[PDB]
């Protein structure tokens with residue numbers, strides 16, 4: 066969950 | 076990849092590292108004289124196991140975030156498919172921190188920089204895993220012996236991360252190609268600087284794998300003892316990687 070969101074961030 | 080490509084991959088890896096290295100060498104070198112007192116060490120030794128694990132997990136997570144930022148900046152990395160990005164970071168992030176620790180480790184008195192001062196192993200005695208701590212200090216002591224430059228660390232950790240052998244990779248050939256270019260980058264720089272003498276001195280491998288399995292094994296014991304500390308007070312990123 067959390068890593069996926071870190072990789073997608075601007 | 077031509078030679079011009081790998082020459083310039085060198086500066087580019089070093090740049091990415093310099094931007095995400097978290098703690099400046101300059102500060103760490105200066106703060107070497109700043110060592111916890113016996114009283115502070117005692118204060119740390121009086122903490123509950125679980126408060127100490129939580130503190131440690133938070134600090135490691137914080138370090139891993141710079142590692143994720145390093146990875147996002149690495150030439151080639153964001154070109155891998157999402158699955159493989161996550162496989163590479165799940166396996167190599169702790170490893171990279173374990174290498175990055177050698178900068179924050181003072182081999183003259185066997186101390187690590189922790190919460191604003193330098194301290195020895197004994198600082199972490201509350202954790203209930205002295206074999207692992209001991210082995211983590213040793214590892215840093217060995218790396219420290221090599222007098223690793225900042226450029227070497229950058230290049231070396233980029234290889235620790237880009238590992239085409241990690242299980243679970245969908246695109247093993249693309250990471251194989253990337254790994255090759257980073258290896259060439261690493262060895263070219265060592266050659267240019269007259270430092271190939273260290274390749275034979277580098278830590279074996281698994282070795283980093285052993286440390287990281289011990290970490291997870293130890294976590295697993297702690298979670299069996301304090302399952303609600305983990306659920307309630309360990310950072311999400313950390314539970315994702317190691318739980």
Ligand SMILES: CC(C)CC[C@@H](O)[C@@H](C)[C@H]1CC[C@H]2[C@@H]3CC=C4C[C@@H](O)CC[C@]4(C)[C@H]3CC[C@]12C
Nearest residue numbers: 097098131134135138175176179189199208290
């Ligand atoms: C469960 C065990 C893996 C805990 C290991 C722990 O007993 C101890 C050795 C760990 C806990 C937090 C760690 C620190 C977290 C953050 C940093 C900054 C980074 O740039 C390098 C490593 C460094 C300086 C780490 C060194 C190793 C520390 C001090």
